[PDB]
Design a protein around this nucleic acid. Structure first.
Lengths: 178, 171, 184, 128, 106
RNA sequence: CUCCACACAAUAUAGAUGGAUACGAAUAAGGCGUCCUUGUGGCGUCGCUGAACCAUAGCAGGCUAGCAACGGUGCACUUGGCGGAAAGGCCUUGGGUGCUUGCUGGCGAAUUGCAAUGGCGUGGGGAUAAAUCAUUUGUAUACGACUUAGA
RNA sequence: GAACGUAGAGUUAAGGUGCCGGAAUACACGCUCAUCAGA
């Protein structure tokens, strides 16, 4: 492979595991931040190996896990040209971490990111609920929009990271209601 | 082209002290009289040593079918040249008229044997009168009682550019 | 006679339809070709598979038929480019063309040109066999389309049955007999 | 339900000197050619290739190799002229002939009567 | 009321040509609904106009017209030869050209 | 997004001048209607081309008069539903308000003299959400680039 | 295939007539399905 640099420092998930629609609606991945490495003593339970019922010392890697929060969803409909999102749905209240993520000059911006979107819950939700029922109707696969609690982390970047997660539970309507 | 029957008689020339030779008669299938006469000489030289300068044609005639309404059955003797060797061949033809049978015979011989009109030498065309003298099986296939079958090739020439119908061989 | 001609591809031959369309585009008739995945090729699957192989040393059926068609038109000319700009080609029948009639070209029909007892080839299976990973997406949309089209046709037949009833009760009138006198 | 090539199958020569005349297969020659006669329609007895003719769903009983006077007898006794005229397809053929026979004042009367019939039907419509 | 057409529209197909040499003088016309040369005998000698629209307004209108006439048939499909006063610009291949009924025999 | 200056515009570019007018499959089979025993049932029909169908009178479609019906139809609304494959369209409620050639009227047409087709750009100001440069970071870095953080 | 002044009109030789490409996706009869026929 030609060794050209990464596009984003947040690496892309090109393939997700297989959808089982007999299991409850649940995530398929997560985004954390690796802290470091240490050494763990444990017992090996491996018959067929000489080290069975024997103390092994093992190198591990620990990734810090802040709890992740869902702020949106994205439904993809199948085209004969490939997957295509017909829309994305956002929630109303989004943090300065996430509104910071859209901005390059947050420190001097008027922070006008999702202002008129907040007027879409000033209404009953008619456009939004129309879109939810649309993603119930269309959009065979569902991805959710998630970001991390990066302020609960010793990272100096106050800007949290947004990602899509394919939701391999059952029932697209129950998925988007979930 | 579409051929024609021809009564063609030749008498090779009455010489001094030889009056009235024997008036050799043949029957030629040809598109015109001219190639009929040429084929008549082409057989007469093969009969015996004549030339077109040696004799003459007595009478060129067209002869029609007496009953061109009835479907007759025919046994035909042909000789021709698979170029190096000759061999005879006997074919049986179900046809209304004689000359159409000879037409179809030339088409079949040119189809299966790559033989030209000059290479084919007709020996005899005669009507098979009664049934079961049809030795060939494929003509005998049409000698059955109360014969019925469906049309093959329901495909026809549509004569137009686009069709609204999504057509069907509906037969 | 029609501004835009909509041509179904189901049950058709590659080259004969390509020749017809390539002639009509150079004639100036605007053409959209729909349900392209159901084009049929003479000969077995395997021969045609080897033909796409030794050509290849684009996988969509539209690209295939566009290739065949573009070979017939003198593509390098500006006139040929305008003729190709007249063309649209689609696997399946996307909107808006789903609500319109799809004509057929009888001289490129499989069932008329092919002798029975011959192997042919489905273009969609060929494209999927050479790496066009969208054929299941196609039939899924086409199933929904056939559902809604069966609904439409069931409504249409009932309404035209009502029209038939109204024309039946309109009959025996003297204006109907005068149309009969004129032939209608 | 199939039509079959057979004796007594009344046929219609779509292409030729007839270009549509009712005839009848008197005898078959092969898979390609047959013998026909159309003496009521006026086309004589002749051999024909089957491409030049189409089969009609009508038939009757006709003797094998029947002569022309016998043919016209069995034709009239079949009375398939009337059975042909009663068929909607021959009605359509006569109709498309009559449409070509139209005059422009006739065609204008067609326009007017279509207007008036449409008025009466649209009154009959939207009440039932 | 709805239609005002006193002509038959038909496609300017091409110039008369061999494989290598084309004649711009004779032009080739496809008249709609004509497949036989016998039907094209009706269209012999008829007055043809190519109607096109210019940018400028020459004499009270921006629409200009070339004229000419049918000379003879061409081929088996009812394709029709035509000769105009000035020849065609050949970017009008496959263009709709109006064929009028005068000079009428009927 | 907005205030002055002037260039076309109320248009058309590969070819407008009645209508692109929608089941699907099978073909050595289909469809339609109908009946029942709902079937691979029976009966009848149909194809054999769209040469169909729909629309189509009125100054390139004038101005009026009634007769009859509660039709048809345009437009702007208005009601609700359907449409995501590229939905960008379809269908409907309810009135309005036109035309109505379904019928019958009454005035105008000419001399065009016998054919000649007959809102969008610029140029100068005003307002605005952001972005960039600059500062700064280092998970990055030859340099860009990446990447923090800052009213 | 044809010894060629410049044109117009017609007719043809050879060669073709699915599309490029002008002109029959004519007609008729048989043969070939080739896991790189054949033209």
């Amino acid at each position: 492979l030609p060794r050209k640099r990464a596009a984003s420092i947040r690496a892309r998930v090109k393939a997700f595991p297989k959808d089982d629609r007999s299991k409850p609606v649940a995530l398929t991945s997560f985004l954390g931040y690796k802290a470091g490495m240490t050494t763990i003593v444990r017992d090996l339970d491996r018959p067929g190996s000489k080290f069975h019922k024997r103390e092994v010392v093992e190198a591990v890697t620990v990734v810090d896990t802040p709890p992740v929060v869902v702020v949106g969803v994205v439904g993809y409909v199948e085209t004969p040209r490939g997957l295509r999102s017909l829309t994305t749905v956002w929630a109303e209240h989004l943090s300065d971490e996430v509104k910071r993520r859209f901005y390059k000059n947050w420190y001097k911006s008027k922070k006008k990111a999702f202002t008129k979107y907040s007027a879409k819950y000033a209404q009953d939700g008619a456009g939004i609920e129309r879109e939810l029922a649309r993603i119930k109707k269309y959009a065979s696969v569902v991805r959710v929009l998630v970001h991390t609690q990066i302020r609960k982390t010793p990272l100096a970047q106050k800007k949290a990271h947004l990602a899509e997660i394919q939701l391999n539970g059952g029932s697209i309507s129950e998925k988007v209601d979930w | 082209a579409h051929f024609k029957e021809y009564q063609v008689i030749g008498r090779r020339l009455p010489t001094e002290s030889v009056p009235e030779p024997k008036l050799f008669r043949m029957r030629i299938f040809a598109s015109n009289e001219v190639i009929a006469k040429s084929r008549y000489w082409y057989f007469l030289q093969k009969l015996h040593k004549v030339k077109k300068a040696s004799g003459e044609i007595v009478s060129i005639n067209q002869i029609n079918e007496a009953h061109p309404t009835k479907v007759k059955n025919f046994g035909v003797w042909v000789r021709y040249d698979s170029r190096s060797g000759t061999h005879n061949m006997y074919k049986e033809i179900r046809d209304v008229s004689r000359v159409a049978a000879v037409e179809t015979l030339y088409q079949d011989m040119a189809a299966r044997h790559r033989a030209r009109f000059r290479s084919i030498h007709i020996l005899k065309v005669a009507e098979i009168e009664k049934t079961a003298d049809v030795k060939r099986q494929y003509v005998k296939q049409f000698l059955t009682k109360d014969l019925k079958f469906p049309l093959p090739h329901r495909v026809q020439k549509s004569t137009k550019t686009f069709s609204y119908k999504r057509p069907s061989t509906f037969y | 006679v029609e501004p835009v001609v909509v041509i179904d591809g189901k049950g058709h031959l590659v080259g004969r339809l390509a020749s017809v369309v390539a002639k009509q585009l150079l004639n100036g008739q605007k053409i959209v070709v729909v349900r392209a995945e159901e084009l049929n090729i003479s000969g077995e699957f395997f021969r045609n598979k080897l033909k796409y192989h030794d050509f290849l040393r684009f996988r969509a059926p539209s690209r295939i038929f566009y290739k065949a068609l573009r070979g017939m038109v003198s593509h390098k000319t500006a006139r040929g480019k305008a003729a190709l700009e007249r063309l649209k080609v689609f696997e399946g029948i996307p909107p808006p063309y789903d609500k319109k009639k799809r004509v057929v070209v009888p001289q490129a029909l499989r069932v008329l040109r092919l002798k029975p007892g011959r192997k042919y080839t489905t273009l969609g299976k060929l494209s999927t066999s050479v790496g066009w990973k969208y054929e299941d997406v196609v039939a899924k949309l086409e199933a929904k389309r056939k559902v809604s089209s069966a609904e439409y046709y069931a409504k249409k037949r009932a309404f035209t049955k009502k029209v038939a009833s109204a024309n039946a009760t309109a009959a025996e009138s003297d204006v109907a007999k005068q149309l009969a006198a004129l032939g209608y | 339900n199939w039509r079959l090539v057979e004796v007594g199958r009344v046929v219609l020569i779509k292409k030729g000197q007839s270009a549509g005349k009712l005839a009848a297969i008197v005898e078959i020659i092969d898979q390609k050619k047959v013998l026909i006669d159309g003496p009521k329609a006026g086309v004589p007895r002749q051999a024909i290739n089957l491409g030049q003719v189409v089969l009609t769903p009508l038939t009757f009983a006709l003797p094998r190799g029947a002569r022309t006077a016998t043919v016209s007898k069995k034709w009239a006794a079949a009375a398939v002229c009337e059975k042909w005229a009663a068929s909607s397809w021959a009605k359509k053929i006569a109709q498309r002939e009559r449409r070509a026979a139209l005059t422009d004042f006739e065609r204008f009367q067609v326009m007017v009567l279509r207007k008036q019939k449409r008025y009466t039907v649209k009154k009959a419509l939207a009440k039932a | 009321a709805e239609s005002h057409r006193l002509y038959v529209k038909g496609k300017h197909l091409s110039y008369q040509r061999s494989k290598r040499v084309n004649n711009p003088n004779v032009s080739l016309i496809k008249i709609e609904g004509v497949a036989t040369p016998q039907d094209a005998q009706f269209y012999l000698g008829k007055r043809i106009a190519y109607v096109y629209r210019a940018s400028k307004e020459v004499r009270g209108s921006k629409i200009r017209v070339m004229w000419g006439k049918v000379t003879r048939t061409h081929g088996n499909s009812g394709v029709v030869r035509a000769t105009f006063r000035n020849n065609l610009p050949a970017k009008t291949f496959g263009a709709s050209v109006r064929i009028f009924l005068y000079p009428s025999n009927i």
